[PDB]
Amino acid sequence: SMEQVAMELRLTELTRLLRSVLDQLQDKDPARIFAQPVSLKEVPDYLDHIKHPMDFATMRKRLEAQGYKNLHEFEEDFDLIIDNCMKYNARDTVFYRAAVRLRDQGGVVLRQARREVDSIG
């Protein structure tokens, strides 16, 4: 139908905007701490601690399959990256501290993303 096509164009445009959001958030991680999944070879107990691992490469896979229906779903995944790290790692670690900085800097980007998503529909 024409409606299904219009819906699909909306999703494609959301995907375009979320790709730009993702790039901007990932720039706030210049150390690449959150770039890839925590390695289960190197941290073999990880899944005993963290039930829903997340990272930027995994988000990018989902994004490119158009697997984010709305900004809330995308934000959920970003918050998993941060919250997983702040639980597994102690406060006095470079990992924890990187997550705090990513959360703080990402907030700005996500605030305007939400306005754009609402504004453009």
Q: b/e for 74-109, b at 16 or more Cβ within 10 A?
A: bbebbebbbebbbebbeeeeeebebbeebbeebeeb
- Alpha-carbon distance of 59 to 36, in angstroms, equals 10
Domain range summary for the chain, segments of one domain joined by + = 1-121
Which residue reads 């941290």 in tokens?
43
Resolution (A): 1.5
Helices (H), the chain: 2-27, 46-49, 56-64, 71-88, 94-120
End-to-end CA distance of the chain: 21
Nearest to 16 by CA among 63, 69, 58, 78: 63
From residue 112, how far is each of 35, 39, 70 by CA, in Å?
23, 33, 15
Nearest to 49 by CA among 104, 107, 95, 105: 95
CB atoms within 10 A of CB 117: 18
- Alpha-carbon distance of 57 to 79, in angstroms, equals 15
Does the domain formed by 1-121 have CATH 1.20.920.10? yes
- C-alpha neighbours within 13 Å on the C-beta side of residue 99: 21
On whether the CB atoms of residues 50 and 87 are closer than 8 A, the answer is yes
- Alpha-carbon distance of 40 to 4, in angstroms, equals 41
Q: What distance separates the 2 farthest-apart alpha carbons in the chain? A: 56
Which residue reads 């210049």 in tokens?
30
DSSP assignment of 62-82: HHHTT---SHHHHHHHHHHHH
